Amino acid sequence: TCSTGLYTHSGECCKACNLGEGVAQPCGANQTVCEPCLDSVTFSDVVSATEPCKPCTECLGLQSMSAPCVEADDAVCRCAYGYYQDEETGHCEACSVCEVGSGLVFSCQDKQNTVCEECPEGTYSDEANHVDPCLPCTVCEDTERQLRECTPWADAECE
């Protein structure tokens, strides 16, 4: 019971709304009414007797959703494909590319930018992106004769 009082959070009197629920009617003179949060529109991640269900956060812009707003949790946004979360600021830069003559070591993903190497010998990279490693040179069988020798920026060419 709680005739007109409100003695609150853990303070027994008024009921709290548990996870997945928010307050619809507070402790008025009557007691607190809870109502279920609406899956993927509303969430409550808190046990509280004042908190309404909160609106689901939207991952916008350079962000993607990696976990859906659900009845007890806000969505988790993460920086989208081609970007990483640069600590030394709030935001998210484009993932650096491994230029021509260079290729992938560590992918670009969380707080972590692309890590590239310059192609070691007998490998080449002829593009600039953040997803190709250095590729092994085409070697050429006695039967064909190569024009171009392999170079860090371009495969050998053959026939």
Binding site: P36, L38, P68, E71, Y81, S107, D132
Partner: protein
């Protein structure tokens, strides 16, 4: 997953699909996919986690790391079965197994 000293042969992307309205079930019929699921009762939304190929050709010939000298190759999105609340011609609401995109795999063929 993640990565360390390794690369995929084919590259994939994921997404949440919130607006799927019809699908092909396991018995090969066309069914309708409900937008939600009645519970005790706050309804939960029906949506799907899907993953497909980024492209068909990560590098020049097809899949990364294939001996393109002796094989053609290609990254193909493959599907698998998941359960969905569904109806057929608006009449038989219930759960059925349906095909959705779930991975990206390399397919070989000889030159």
């Amino acid at each position: 997953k993640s990565h360390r000293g390794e690369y995929s042969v084919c590259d994939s992307e994921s997404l949440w699909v919130t607006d799927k309205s019809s699908a092909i079930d396991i018995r090969g019929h066309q069914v309708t996919v409900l937008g939600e699921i009645k519970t005790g009762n706050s309804p939960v939304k029906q949506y799907f986690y899907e993953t497909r190929c980024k492209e068909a050709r990560p590098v020049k010939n097809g899949c990364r790391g294939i001996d393109d000298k002796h094989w053609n190759s290609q990254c193909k999105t493959s599907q698998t079965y998941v359960r969905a609340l569904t109806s057929e011609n608006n009449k038989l609401v219930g759960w059925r197994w349906i095909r959705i995109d779930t991975s990206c795999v390399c397919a070989l063929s000889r030159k």
